[PDB]
Amino acid sequence: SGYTPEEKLRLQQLRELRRRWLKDQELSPREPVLPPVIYKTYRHSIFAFTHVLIPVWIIHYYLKYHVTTKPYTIVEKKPRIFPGDTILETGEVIPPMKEFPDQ
Amino acid sequence: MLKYIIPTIMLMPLTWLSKNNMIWVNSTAHSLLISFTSLLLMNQFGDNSLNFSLLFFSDSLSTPLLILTMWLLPLMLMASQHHLSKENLTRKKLFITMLISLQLFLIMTFTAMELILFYILFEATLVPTLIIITRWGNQTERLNAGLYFLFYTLAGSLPLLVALIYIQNTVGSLNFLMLQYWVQPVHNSWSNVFMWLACMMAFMVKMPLYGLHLWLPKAHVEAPIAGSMVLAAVLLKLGGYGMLRITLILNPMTDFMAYPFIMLSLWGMIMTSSICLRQTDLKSLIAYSSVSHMALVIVAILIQTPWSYMGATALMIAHGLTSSMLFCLANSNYERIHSRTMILARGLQTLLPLMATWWLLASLTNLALPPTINLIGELFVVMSTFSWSNITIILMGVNMVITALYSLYMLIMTQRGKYTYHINNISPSFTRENALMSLHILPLLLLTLNPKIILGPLY
Amino acid sequence: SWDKDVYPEPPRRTPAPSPQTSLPNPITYLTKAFDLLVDRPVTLVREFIERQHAKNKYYYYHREFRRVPDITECQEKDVLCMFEAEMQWRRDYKVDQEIVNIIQERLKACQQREGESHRQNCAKELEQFTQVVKAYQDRYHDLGAHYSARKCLAKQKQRMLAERKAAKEA
Amino acid sequence: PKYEASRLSSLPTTLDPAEYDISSETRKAQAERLAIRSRLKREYQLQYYDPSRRGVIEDPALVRWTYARSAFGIGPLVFWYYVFKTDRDRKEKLIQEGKLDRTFNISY
Amino acid sequence: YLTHQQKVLRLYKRALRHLESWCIHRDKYRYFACLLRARFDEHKNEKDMVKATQLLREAEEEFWHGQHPQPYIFPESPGGTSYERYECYKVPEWCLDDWHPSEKAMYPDYFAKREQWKKLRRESWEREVKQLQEETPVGGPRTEALPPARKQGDLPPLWWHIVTRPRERPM
Amino acid sequence: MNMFSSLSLVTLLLLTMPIMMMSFNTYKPSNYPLYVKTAISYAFITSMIPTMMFIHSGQELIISNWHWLTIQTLKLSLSFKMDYFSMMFIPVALFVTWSIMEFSMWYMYSDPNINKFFKYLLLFLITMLILVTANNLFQLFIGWEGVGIMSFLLIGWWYGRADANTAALQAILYNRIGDIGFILAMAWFLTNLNTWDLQQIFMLNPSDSNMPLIGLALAATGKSAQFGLHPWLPSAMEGPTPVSALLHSSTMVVAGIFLLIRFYPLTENNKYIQSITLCLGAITTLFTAMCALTQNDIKKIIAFSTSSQLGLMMVTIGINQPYLAFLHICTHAFFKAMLFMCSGSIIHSLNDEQDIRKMGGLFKAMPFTTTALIVGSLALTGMPFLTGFYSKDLIIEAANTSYTNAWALLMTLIATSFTAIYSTRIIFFALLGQPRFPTLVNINENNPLLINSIKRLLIGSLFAGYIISNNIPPTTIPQMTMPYYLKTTALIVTILGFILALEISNMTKNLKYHYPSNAFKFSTLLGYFPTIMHRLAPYMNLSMSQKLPKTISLAQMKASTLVTNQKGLIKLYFLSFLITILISMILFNFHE
Ligand SMILES: CCCCCCCCCCCCO[C@@H]1O[C@H](CO)[C@@H](O[C@H]2O[C@H](CO)[C@@H](O)[C@H](O)[C@H]2O)[C@H](O)[C@H]1O
Ligand SMILES: CCCCCCCCCCCCO[C@@H]1O[C@H](CO)[C@@H](O[C@H]2O[C@H](CO)[C@@H](O)[C@H](O)[C@H]2O)[C@H](O)[C@H]1O
Ligand SMILES: CCCCCCCCCCCCO[C@@H]1O[C@H](CO)[C@@H](O[C@H]2O[C@H](CO)[C@@H](O)[C@H](O)[C@H]2O)[C@H](O)[C@H]1O
Ligand SMILES: CCCCCCCCCCCCO[C@@H]1O[C@H](CO)[C@@H](O[C@H]2O[C@H](CO)[C@@H](O)[C@H](O)[C@H]2O)[C@H](O)[C@H]1O
C-alpha cells in the first residue's frame, strides 16, 4: 500500500518547493521598513485625572445644574427613621418604643 | 414647495451643460445641497399641517418621506457611476435625467393636497422607473420585469382613478384638507365594498401585499442598483403613504374590509420570512425581506390606531435606509464577482474587513436591534396589534425569530466561513463604496437620538 | 426651578448621625473629598457662566391661545369655523396628554420615595391617577388614528345617551 | 438489534449490505464515476492554476442549480381568519356589556 | 473502491480508538488492545474469501453495537474542538497583489523574493500544460493522480496552489 | 445624593470611554487590553462607593436624566435604578470581569485581533450593566438584546469554523424564542397599565398577572437556558474560554434569573407562576446535572454545571425567595468564573486539549491551578463556610421547609447530589492518576497575569459569600427552626455524592470491559434533545417553503387569433355585415 515511484517523486519535488517557499516567508533584519514606581503612579495618576475626575466634574455639573433642576428627575427613597432618631431639618425627636417583655 | 421643485428641475440643465468628466461631481454635489435644504420642512406644528399653497402641503407624514427621497438621489448617483463608466456620455446624462425626473415626481407626489394630483404624480413615477429597469438592466428578463411591474400597477391604479373621480362628484372636492372636514361615514353596501377595494388595491400592489408581491422580486433581480435603491426605499412607500391618506374616507367600512388583507399580511410575513431562509439570489432574498417588513406596515395602517400609525411611519423610514443599504452591499459584491448567487463568494470578512462591519450593521438593523428606529417602528406595531387581538403576538414573535435567522444567515453565508479558492479578484473596498454604506447607516443610527421626527402626525 | 404645587414633594426628614462605633466612617471622608475636589470647582465654573448670563438678560414667553368656538357651535360643513374648532381641539388633546403625564410622574415619584411603605402612603396619588385616566379614557379612547373633534363629539353624545337612558330606567 | 435508518439518520456505510458484495458491474460503474470526477477536476485545475487568470471560474453546475431553483394557500388564511374573528367578536361583546376590564387602557 | 484489506485495516484502527475512549487509563487500554489484536490475528489467514467477508460484516455489526457514543477526537481532526479554528487567519497569497505601494515598501526584501516566484510560475506554466496533454489519454484523465516533472528544470505540473498554500498557523 | 448619583453614573461613563477612544482621539493600540482592563479595575473602585452608602443607610435612588421620547401618555426617559440588586451586582460583575480581562491578556495573547476581542468583552459588560440598572422595560430590552448579540459575536469568534458559526446562530435562535415572552410582557403592561416603568407597574400591582408573568418566565427560560430552550448554553462552548467565563458568571445567563428577581413584587402574589417556575427549575437542575455526569469535554462539564446552577436559581424563584436567588447569582459568579479560568489554564498547557480522558496527573505539575480548582469545586458543592455555602444551603433549607411541589423538592436534592459527582469527575480525571497527555511537556502556569487573576477570584470564592451575607439588609424572615434531617440534607446528600462518585471513578481502573447502558447513552447524548430537535425542527421549517398572469395573457393571445385570423375575402366581410344588421333588428331592436 506504499507510494508508487511516481507518487514519491512528485511528493519529493513538491516538498522541495514548499520548503523553499516557507523559507522565503522569513522577514529580513530591516523588515518592516517603517516610516520615521514613579512611572507607575504618574501613569495611574494621569489615568485617574482623565477617566475619573474630568468625567465626574462633567457628570456632577450636569446632574447639579440641568437634571436636578427639573421635577422628579432624581428621586430618592426617603431615609428610614428608627425609634430614637433626631430629625435634622426640624429638630424633632422620635419617641422610643414601648418596653419589651423579657425574652 | 417651489423651493424644492425648481432646484430639482435645474439639476437637469446642470447635468447636460456640465463638462463631460464633471457630470457625476456636479449632479452629486448639487443634489446634496438640495437634500440639505429639505430640512426646512421640519417646521411642523402640533395642530396644523404646513400648508404652502393651493397645490402642496407638508405634514409630519410627508416630511420624513421627502427628506428620504432627496437624500436618496445623491446616494443613487454615487452607486450608479461605476457600472455606467463605459456608457457613452449622452446615455449617462439621460440616466441621470431619469433619476432627477423621478425625484421631481416623488416630492410632488408626497406634497399634493388634491388626490387626483397625487394620482397623476403617483402614476408618473412609473415611466422613469420602468425606463431605468428595461434600458439599464443587465439581463434578458428585465423586459418581462418591466411588463409585470407596469401591468400589476395599472391593474389596480385604473379602478383607483374611477373611485377618485366618483368621490369628487359625490363630495365636491378631493383636497385632503377639505376631506378631513367633509368626510362622511361609509355605510354597508356592495357598492361601497367595491369603492373600498378600488380605493385600496392600487396601494396594496405597491406595498406589496402578500399574494400580490411576485412582481417585486422579479423587478429587483433585473433592476440596476439605483433602480433597486429607489424602488425599495421610496416607491414601495408610495403605497404606504397612499393608504395612510385614503383610509380617512373609508371608515367605518375598514372595520370588516381589512380582515382578509390583515390575514394575508399576518400570514404572509411569516411565509416571506421563511422563504428568505432558502433564497439563493442575494437580491431576491432582500426583495422577499421587504415584503415581510411591509406586511407589518399594512397591518398597522389597517388597524388604524395612533400607536400603529406611528409605528408604520417609523417602519417605512427605517426600512427604506436599511433595504437600500443591503442592495448597495449586495451590489458591491456583484461588481467584483458578477453574480448574485449568495453561496458563490464566501468568507469575505477575511478579504474585506471593513465591508464586513457594514454588513454587520445592516443586518443588525434588519433584525431590529434595540434601540434602532427599525425596532421602534416594529415594536409600536407589535404593541398596537396586541390590543387589536392578543393572539397576534404569536405570529409577531415567530416572525421576529425567523427574521433574525435569515438576517444572520445572510451575514454568516457571505462574510464568514472559508473564502472561495478560485475567486481571486476581490480587490480592496473603494472609498466610494465605504462612503456609500456609511451614508445609509450613520443617519439611520443618528435617528435613534431623536426618533420623534420620524413618528408622523400621530406623534 | 419648577412649581412645587404641580410637582409636590413632602417635607424631608433626615435623621442625624448617631455613631455606635469608634471606627471612622469612610463615607464621611469621601463626602468631604467630593465637596472639595468636585463640587467647588464645578460651582466655580457655573458661577462664571452665570455672570456672563447676567450681562445679557433676554426673555421668552409662553404662548397664549385665545378660546374659539367649539365644534358643537359649527354649522355642518362650514370649514372656516370647523378649522379653528378642530385646531383648538387638537391643542387641548395634546395638553390633556401632558396632564396625564404629570399625574403619572407624581405617582411614580411617590412609589420610589415611599419605599416599602408605598402601597399605603401613595393612595392619594393612586386615586388621582385613577380619575384622570378615566376622564382621559372617556374623552379620547377608541377614536382611531383619524381622530377629530367631530368623532370626539359623536362619542360624548353616545355616552350622554347611555347615561340618559340608565337614569330614566331608575 | 439491527440499525433502522431514518430520513434524518442514514444507514452507516459499514452496515450497508451492498458495500461488501461488489461485482464487476459495480466496479465498472465506480470507475466510470471516478473518470467523470477526474475529467471535471482537470478542467477545473487548468483554470485554477492558470497564472494569468483573474476572476471567477464560472461553474455550470452552480448556474444550473440557481436556475433550476429560481424557476396551503387559503386554508391558513381561513383558519387564522376564524381565530382572530372569533376572538375579536368575543372581545367586542364584552366591552359593550362592560364586562372587559380597561381601567388603565389609554394607549392603543 | 476500498479493498477488503483496506476495510479490515480501517476497522481495526477505528475499533482501537473507540476502545481507548472506553478504557481511558493506559494500563487498562494496553491490556484490552492486545486482546482486540488477538481477535484479528485469529482470522488472519482465512483464505475462504466468502468466510472472510462474513467475518468483517459481523465485526462491523459488533463495532456499531459497542462503539463509544462520545469517542475521543484529535482537536484538529474533523469534528474536534480546534477543527478549522485558524481558517479565519488564512489569507490567500494573491491578496498581496492589491497591497498599496506604501505597504509593499515596508517589506522590500519579501516582495522582491515574491516576484522571483511569480516569474518561476509564469515561465513554467506552458511546459506543465504540455506535459499534462502528452500524458493524458484520449478519454481524459481516468484518475486524479498527477505526475512528477520528468526533465531538469521542469516543475511538477500544477504545483502553485500546493507549494504556496497558507501556513497551518498563519498569524 | 450628589456624590451617590454622580459616582454611580461615572461607573457607567468610565466603561464606555475605551469604546469612544476607538474613534482614534487618543488611542494606544500597543496595549489596548491593558487600557480596557485598567478601566474595569477603576470602575470597580468607583462603584464600591455607592455600594458602601447603600450598605450603610440603605440609600437608593432613580436617575431619569434624559427625556428621550413621549408617545402621547407614555413618556420614555433614560432612567437608571440604583437599588439593592444593582448596587450589589455591579461591583461583583466588575470584580469578576476584572479578573477575566487580566486572564484574557494571557490566554488570548497570540490572537491577532486581541484588541477587538477586548472591545467586544467591554461591550458585552456594558450591555449587561444597561440591563441590570434599567428602570423601564424598553431600556431593559436594549440590554437584553445587546447581550444576546454580543454573545453571538463572541461565541462565533473563530468565524472560519462552521461549528462556531452554527453555535453562535443557535444562541440567537433560542434567545429570540424567549424574546417572544419579553415583548408579550411589554405589550400587556402597556395595554393594561399604560406604562413600561417598573415604578408604575409595582404601584398599580395587577392581580391578573398570569399573562405578563408567563411572558417573563418564557424570556427567562431562553436567557437562563432552562429546560426546553437549554441546548444553546453547552453549545456556546465554541467561544474562546474567556467568553465562557464571562458568559456563565457575570453577564448573559443570569439575566433571565435577574429579570424574574426584578419582578418579585408581582410574582410573590401569584402562586400559579411560582408553581411553574419551581417545576421548570427542578427539571432543569436535574436534567443538566445528569448530562454533566458523562461529558468528557471539560468546558461542557462546566457549562452543564452552569445550567444546573441556573435551574437551582429558578427553583429559588419558584419558592418565593427572590433575594436568595439573587445571592446565588453573586456567589456563583466568583467560583464559576474561576473554574473556567482553571480549565483554560489546563487547556493552554496541554496545547488546546479539552478531553479529560487525555489529562490526568496534573495535581503536582500545576500546583496553583490545582489549588484554585479544588477551592472552586468545594465552593460549588456547598463546602461549609465557602462562598457557595452562604446561598445554596439557605436555598436548600428554605425549599425543604416550604409549602412546595414534592416532586420538585426531590429533583433539586438529587441534583445537589449530582453536583458532587461531576465535580469529583473533573478533579479525578484531570488532576489524579497518571499523565495521559502527549509526551512533549509544555506545562507552565508561571505567568503573573494568570496567577493574579485566578488569585483574586480564589479569594472571592473563600470570603465573598461571608462578606456579602453580613452586609446586606434582611428583607425576609429566614426559616431557622427545622428538624435535624431537614437542616443537614444538603450536606448529607453532598457527602453521599462524593462517596458515590469516588467508587465509580475508581471502578474505571479495573480490568473489566463494560458495554453501554441506555442510561449512559441518554446522559452522554443529552437526552437526545439536540439530536432530534436540531434535525427535525430545522428540516420541517426549511422544507415548508417548497410546499394568474400566465392565464390572462393566454386568454388575450387566444382572443387575438380569433379576431385577426381572417381570410381577407370581400364576400365574407360583407356577409357578416348582413348578420350584424339582422341581429341589430331581431335581437336588440335598435331600429326602435
Ligand atoms: C432665441 C431663443 C432661443 C434662446 C436660446 C438660449 C440659449 C442659446 C445657447 C447658445 C450656446 C450653445 O452652446 C453650444 O452648445 C454646447 C453647450 O452650450 C457647447 O458644447 C458643450 O459640449 C459638452 C456637452 O456636450 C460640454 O463640454 C459642455 O456642455 C459644452 O462645452 C458648445 O461648445 C456651444 O457652442
Ligand atoms: C380580498 C377581497 C375581500 C372581500 C371582502 C368581501 C366582504 C363582503 C361584505 C358583505 C356585505 C356587503 O354589504 C351588504 O350589501 C347588502 C346589499 O343588498 C346590504 O343589504 C341590503 O340588501 C339586502 C338584500 O339582500 C336587504 O335585505 C337589506 O335590507 C339591504 O339593506 C347589507 O346591508 C350589506 O351588509
Ligand atoms: C460540601 C463539601 C463536602 C466535601 C466532602 C468530601 C467527601 C469525601 C468523601 C471521601 C470518602 C472516603 O473515600 C475513600 O477513600 C479511600 C482512599 O484510601 C478509598 O479506599 C479504598 O479505595 C481505593 C480504590 O480501591 C484505593 O485507592 C484506596 O487505597 C483504598 O483505601 C475509597 O475510594 C473510599 O473508601
Ligand atoms: C387585469 C389587468 C392587467 C392585465 C394586462 C393584460 C395586458 C395584455 C398582455 C398581453 C397579452 C398577450 O401576450 C402574450 O401572452 C402569451 C401568454 O402569456 C405569451 O405566450 C407565451 O407564453 C405561453 C404560455 O404562457 C406560450 O404558450 C406561448 O407559446 C408563448 O409565446 C406571449 O408571449 C405574450 O406576448
Side-chain angles (χ1 to χ4, degrees), chain B residues 156 160 195-205 239 242-243 246-247 250 254 261 301-302:
Chain B
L160 175 65
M195 188 194 66
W196 195 99
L197 285 165
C199 279
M200 290 291 293
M201 283 326 296
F203 305 130
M204 293 279 168
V205 167
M243 275 160 62
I246 201 160
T247 47
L250 294 181
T254 308
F261 300 92
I301 293 163
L302 288 177

PDB file of all heavy atoms in Angstrom, chain B residues 156 160 195-205 239 242-243 246-247 250 254 261 301-302:
ATOM      1  N   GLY B 156     -54.407  47.852 -10.775  1.00  0.00           N
ATOM      2  CA  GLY B 156     -55.003  48.406  -9.577  1.00  0.00           C
ATOM      3  C   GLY B 156     -55.260  49.895  -9.675  1.00  0.00           C
ATOM      4  O   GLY B 156     -56.214  50.404  -9.088  1.00  0.00           O
ATOM      5  N   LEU B 160     -58.679  52.797  -9.084  1.00  0.00           N
ATOM      6  CA  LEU B 160     -58.493  53.910  -8.160  1.00  0.00           C
ATOM      7  C   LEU B 160     -58.901  55.231  -8.796  1.00  0.00           C
ATOM      8  O   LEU B 160     -59.562  56.055  -8.159  1.00  0.00           O
ATOM      9  CB  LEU B 160     -57.038  53.970  -7.698  1.00  0.00           C
ATOM     10  CG  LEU B 160     -56.637  55.156  -6.819  1.00  0.00           C
ATOM     11  CD1 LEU B 160     -57.358  55.117  -5.482  1.00  0.00           C
ATOM     12  CD2 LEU B 160     -55.136  55.184  -6.620  1.00  0.00           C
ATOM     13  N   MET B 195     -66.117  50.351  -3.905  1.00  0.00           N
ATOM     14  CA  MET B 195     -65.434  51.621  -3.695  1.00  0.00           C
ATOM     15  C   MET B 195     -64.231  51.442  -2.777  1.00  0.00           C
ATOM     16  O   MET B 195     -63.146  51.951  -3.063  1.00  0.00           O
ATOM     17  CB  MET B 195     -66.397  52.658  -3.125  1.00  0.00           C
ATOM     18  CG  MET B 195     -65.817  54.065  -3.062  1.00  0.00           C
ATOM     19  SD  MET B 195     -66.765  55.196  -2.030  1.00  0.00           S
ATOM     20  CE  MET B 195     -66.542  54.470  -0.406  1.00  0.00           C
ATOM     21  N   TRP B 196     -64.401  50.691  -1.688  1.00  0.00           N
ATOM     22  CA  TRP B 196     -63.294  50.437  -0.774  1.00  0.00           C
ATOM     23  C   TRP B 196     -62.141  49.742  -1.488  1.00  0.00           C
ATOM     24  O   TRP B 196     -60.985  50.158  -1.374  1.00  0.00           O
ATOM     25  CB  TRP B 196     -63.783  49.597   0.407  1.00  0.00           C
ATOM     26  CG  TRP B 196     -62.849  49.567   1.577  1.00  0.00           C
ATOM     27  CD1 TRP B 196     -62.942  50.310   2.709  1.00  0.00           C
ATOM     28  CD2 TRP B 196     -61.684  48.750   1.727  1.00  0.00           C
ATOM     29  NE1 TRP B 196     -61.911  50.014   3.556  1.00  0.00           N
ATOM     30  CE2 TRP B 196     -61.121  49.058   2.977  1.00  0.00           C
ATOM     31  CE3 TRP B 196     -61.059  47.793   0.924  1.00  0.00           C
ATOM     32  CZ2 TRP B 196     -59.963  48.442   3.450  1.00  0.00           C
ATOM     33  CZ3 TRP B 196     -59.909  47.184   1.390  1.00  0.00           C
ATOM     34  CH2 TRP B 196     -59.372  47.511   2.643  1.00  0.00           C
ATOM     35  N   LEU B 197     -62.441  48.673  -2.228  1.00  0.00           N
ATOM     36  CA  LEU B 197     -61.401  47.925  -2.926  1.00  0.00           C
ATOM     37  C   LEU B 197     -60.731  48.769  -3.999  1.00  0.00           C
ATOM     38  O   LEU B 197     -59.516  48.678  -4.199  1.00  0.00           O
ATOM     39  CB  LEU B 197     -61.986  46.658  -3.543  1.00  0.00           C
ATOM     40  CG  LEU B 197     -62.300  45.512  -2.583  1.00  0.00           C
ATOM     41  CD1 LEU B 197     -63.197  44.506  -3.258  1.00  0.00           C
ATOM     42  CD2 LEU B 197     -61.028  44.855  -2.087  1.00  0.00           C
ATOM     43  N   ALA B 198     -61.506  49.582  -4.713  1.00  0.00           N
ATOM     44  CA  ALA B 198     -60.916  50.454  -5.717  1.00  0.00           C
ATOM     45  C   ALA B 198     -60.026  51.511  -5.081  1.00  0.00           C
ATOM     46  O   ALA B 198     -59.015  51.902  -5.669  1.00  0.00           O
ATOM     47  CB  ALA B 198     -62.014  51.110  -6.549  1.00  0.00           C
ATOM     48  N   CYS B 199     -60.373  51.976  -3.883  1.00  0.00           N
ATOM     49  CA  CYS B 199     -59.564  52.970  -3.194  1.00  0.00           C
ATOM     50  C   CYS B 199     -58.279  52.397  -2.618  1.00  0.00           C
ATOM     51  O   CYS B 199     -57.373  53.167  -2.294  1.00  0.00           O
ATOM     52  CB  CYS B 199     -60.373  53.618  -2.070  1.00  0.00           C
ATOM     53  SG  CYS B 199     -61.481  54.913  -2.628  1.00  0.00           S
ATOM     54  N   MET B 200     -58.168  51.080  -2.498  1.00  0.00           N
ATOM     55  CA  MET B 200     -57.100  50.457  -1.733  1.00  0.00           C
ATOM     56  C   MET B 200     -56.206  49.530  -2.540  1.00  0.00           C
ATOM     57  O   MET B 200     -55.014  49.454  -2.249  1.00  0.00           O
ATOM     58  CB  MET B 200     -57.697  49.659  -0.558  1.00  0.00           C
ATOM     59  CG  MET B 200     -58.303  50.527   0.530  1.00  0.00           C
ATOM     60  SD  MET B 200     -57.096  51.480   1.469  1.00  0.00           S
ATOM     61  CE  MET B 200     -56.243  50.145   2.286  1.00  0.00           C
ATOM     62  N   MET B 201     -56.739  48.831  -3.545  1.00  0.00           N
ATOM     63  CA  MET B 201     -55.975  47.770  -4.195  1.00  0.00           C
ATOM     64  C   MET B 201     -54.729  48.298  -4.890  1.00  0.00           C
ATOM     65  O   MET B 201     -53.712  47.602  -4.937  1.00  0.00           O
ATOM     66  CB  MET B 201     -56.852  47.025  -5.201  1.00  0.00           C
ATOM     67  CG  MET B 201     -57.844  46.031  -4.604  1.00  0.00           C
ATOM     68  SD  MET B 201     -57.320  45.145  -3.122  1.00  0.00           S
ATOM     69  CE  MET B 201     -55.941  44.202  -3.734  1.00  0.00           C
ATOM     70  N   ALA B 202     -54.788  49.504  -5.456  1.00  0.00           N
ATOM     71  CA  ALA B 202     -53.606  50.060  -6.104  1.00  0.00           C
ATOM     72  C   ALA B 202     -52.458  50.212  -5.115  1.00  0.00           C
ATOM     73  O   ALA B 202     -51.311  49.883  -5.432  1.00  0.00           O
ATOM     74  CB  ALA B 202     -53.940  51.404  -6.748  1.00  0.00           C
ATOM     75  N   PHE B 203     -52.749  50.701  -3.910  1.00  0.00           N
ATOM     76  CA  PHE B 203     -51.719  50.829  -2.888  1.00  0.00           C
ATOM     77  C   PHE B 203     -51.275  49.473  -2.364  1.00  0.00           C
ATOM     78  O   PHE B 203     -50.111  49.310  -1.992  1.00  0.00           O
ATOM     79  CB  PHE B 203     -52.227  51.693  -1.739  1.00  0.00           C
ATOM     80  CG  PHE B 203     -52.711  53.034  -2.170  1.00  0.00           C
ATOM     81  CD1 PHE B 203     -53.942  53.502  -1.760  1.00  0.00           C
ATOM     82  CD2 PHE B 203     -51.945  53.823  -3.007  1.00  0.00           C
ATOM     83  CE1 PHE B 203     -54.393  54.735  -2.168  1.00  0.00           C
ATOM     84  CE2 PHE B 203     -52.394  55.053  -3.414  1.00  0.00           C
ATOM     85  CZ  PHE B 203     -53.619  55.510  -2.992  1.00  0.00           C
ATOM     86  N   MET B 204     -52.181  48.499  -2.318  1.00  0.00           N
ATOM     87  CA  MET B 204     -51.801  47.158  -1.894  1.00  0.00           C
ATOM     88  C   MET B 204     -50.769  46.556  -2.832  1.00  0.00           C
ATOM     89  O   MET B 204     -49.824  45.902  -2.387  1.00  0.00           O
ATOM     90  CB  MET B 204     -53.031  46.260  -1.822  1.00  0.00           C
ATOM     91  CG  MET B 204     -53.998  46.650  -0.742  1.00  0.00           C
ATOM     92  SD  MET B 204     -53.451  46.026   0.849  1.00  0.00           S
ATOM     93  CE  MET B 204     -54.523  46.910   1.966  1.00  0.00           C
ATOM     94  N   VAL B 205     -50.939  46.757  -4.135  1.00  0.00           N
ATOM     95  CA  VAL B 205     -49.983  46.206  -5.086  1.00  0.00           C
ATOM     96  C   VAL B 205     -48.611  46.834  -4.887  1.00  0.00           C
ATOM     97  O   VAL B 205     -47.588  46.150  -4.958  1.00  0.00           O
ATOM     98  CB  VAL B 205     -50.497  46.390  -6.526  1.00  0.00           C
ATOM     99  CG1 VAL B 205     -49.387  46.113  -7.528  1.00  0.00           C
ATOM    100  CG2 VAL B 205     -51.662  45.469  -6.769  1.00  0.00           C
ATOM    101  N   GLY B 239     -47.306  53.449  -1.838  1.00  0.00           N
ATOM    102  CA  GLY B 239     -48.500  52.726  -1.443  1.00  0.00           C
ATOM    103  C   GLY B 239     -48.793  52.852   0.038  1.00  0.00           C
ATOM    104  O   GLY B 239     -49.952  52.956   0.441  1.00  0.00           O
ATOM    105  N   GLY B 242     -50.097  56.314   0.416  1.00  0.00           N
ATOM    106  CA  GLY B 242     -51.433  56.412  -0.139  1.00  0.00           C
ATOM    107  C   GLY B 242     -52.490  55.822   0.772  1.00  0.00           C
ATOM    108  O   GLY B 242     -53.565  56.396   0.938  1.00  0.00           O
ATOM    109  N   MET B 243     -52.201  54.663   1.366  1.00  0.00           N
ATOM    110  CA  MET B 243     -53.150  54.046   2.285  1.00  0.00           C
ATOM    111  C   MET B 243     -53.364  54.905   3.522  1.00  0.00           C
ATOM    112  O   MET B 243     -54.497  55.066   3.980  1.00  0.00           O
ATOM    113  CB  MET B 243     -52.671  52.653   2.680  1.00  0.00           C
ATOM    114  CG  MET B 243     -53.067  51.575   1.704  1.00  0.00           C
ATOM    115  SD  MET B 243     -52.070  50.074   1.823  1.00  0.00           S
ATOM    116  CE  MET B 243     -52.421  49.559   3.494  1.00  0.00           C
ATOM    117  N   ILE B 246     -55.820  57.720   2.337  1.00  0.00           N
ATOM    118  CA  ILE B 246     -57.152  57.432   1.818  1.00  0.00           C
ATOM    119  C   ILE B 246     -58.022  56.682   2.819  1.00  0.00           C
ATOM    120  O   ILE B 246     -59.246  56.673   2.669  1.00  0.00           O
ATOM    121  CB  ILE B 246     -57.046  56.654   0.492  1.00  0.00           C
ATOM    122  CG1 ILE B 246     -58.337  56.797  -0.317  1.00  0.00           C
ATOM    123  CG2 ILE B 246     -56.742  55.189   0.743  1.00  0.00           C
ATOM    124  CD1 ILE B 246     -58.171  56.502  -1.785  1.00  0.00           C
ATOM    125  N   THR B 247     -57.432  56.059   3.839  1.00  0.00           N
ATOM    126  CA  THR B 247     -58.235  55.407   4.864  1.00  0.00           C
ATOM    127  C   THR B 247     -59.098  56.404   5.620  1.00  0.00           C
ATOM    128  O   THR B 247     -60.098  56.009   6.222  1.00  0.00           O
ATOM    129  CB  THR B 247     -57.351  54.650   5.852  1.00  0.00           C
ATOM    130  OG1 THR B 247     -56.261  55.479   6.266  1.00  0.00           O
ATOM    131  CG2 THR B 247     -56.822  53.371   5.225  1.00  0.00           C
ATOM    132  N   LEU B 250     -62.658  56.049   4.448  1.00  0.00           N
ATOM    133  CA  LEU B 250     -63.144  54.683   4.323  1.00  0.00           C
ATOM    134  C   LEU B 250     -63.743  54.133   5.606  1.00  0.00           C
ATOM    135  O   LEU B 250     -64.119  52.959   5.641  1.00  0.00           O
ATOM    136  CB  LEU B 250     -62.011  53.772   3.836  1.00  0.00           C
ATOM    137  CG  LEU B 250     -61.525  54.083   2.416  1.00  0.00           C
ATOM    138  CD1 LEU B 250     -60.437  53.125   1.995  1.00  0.00           C
ATOM    139  CD2 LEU B 250     -62.673  54.072   1.407  1.00  0.00           C
ATOM    140  N   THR B 254     -63.738  50.043   6.852  1.00  0.00           N
ATOM    141  CA  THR B 254     -62.456  49.385   7.065  1.00  0.00           C
ATOM    142  C   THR B 254     -62.525  48.362   8.185  1.00  0.00           C
ATOM    143  O   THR B 254     -61.695  47.451   8.227  1.00  0.00           O
ATOM    144  CB  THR B 254     -61.374  50.417   7.387  1.00  0.00           C
ATOM    145  OG1 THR B 254     -61.377  51.443   6.393  1.00  0.00           O
ATOM    146  CG2 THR B 254     -59.997  49.768   7.442  1.00  0.00           C
ATOM    147  N   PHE B 261     -57.131  41.253   4.236  1.00  0.00           N
ATOM    148  CA  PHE B 261     -55.802  41.794   3.985  1.00  0.00           C
ATOM    149  C   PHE B 261     -54.903  41.655   5.203  1.00  0.00           C
ATOM    150  O   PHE B 261     -53.702  41.417   5.061  1.00  0.00           O
ATOM    151  CB  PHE B 261     -55.922  43.249   3.546  1.00  0.00           C
ATOM    152  CG  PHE B 261     -56.731  43.411   2.307  1.00  0.00           C
ATOM    153  CD1 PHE B 261     -58.088  43.653   2.378  1.00  0.00           C
ATOM    154  CD2 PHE B 261     -56.143  43.263   1.064  1.00  0.00           C
ATOM    155  CE1 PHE B 261     -58.838  43.770   1.237  1.00  0.00           C
ATOM    156  CE2 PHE B 261     -56.886  43.381  -0.078  1.00  0.00           C
ATOM    157  CZ  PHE B 261     -58.238  43.635   0.004  1.00  0.00           C
ATOM    158  N   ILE B 301     -51.478  50.121   9.208  1.00  0.00           N
ATOM    159  CA  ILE B 301     -52.380  51.078   8.579  1.00  0.00           C
ATOM    160  C   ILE B 301     -53.826  50.619   8.704  1.00  0.00           C
ATOM    161  O   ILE B 301     -54.730  51.433   8.915  1.00  0.00           O
ATOM    162  CB  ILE B 301     -51.995  51.302   7.106  1.00  0.00           C
ATOM    163  CG1 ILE B 301     -50.638  51.998   6.999  1.00  0.00           C
ATOM    164  CG2 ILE B 301     -53.072  52.112   6.408  1.00  0.00           C
ATOM    165  CD1 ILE B 301     -50.012  51.902   5.636  1.00  0.00           C
ATOM    166  N   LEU B 302     -54.071  49.320   8.565  1.00  0.00           N
ATOM    167  CA  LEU B 302     -55.443  48.837   8.517  1.00  0.00           C
ATOM    168  C   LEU B 302     -56.110  48.861   9.886  1.00  0.00           C
ATOM    169  O   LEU B 302     -57.310  49.122   9.971  1.00  0.00           O
ATOM    170  CB  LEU B 302     -55.487  47.429   7.929  1.00  0.00           C
ATOM    171  CG  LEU B 302     -55.219  47.318   6.426  1.00  0.00           C
ATOM    172  CD1 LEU B 302     -55.216  45.865   5.997  1.00  0.00           C
ATOM    173  CD2 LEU B 302     -56.239  48.109   5.640  1.00  0.00           C
TER     174      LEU B 302
END
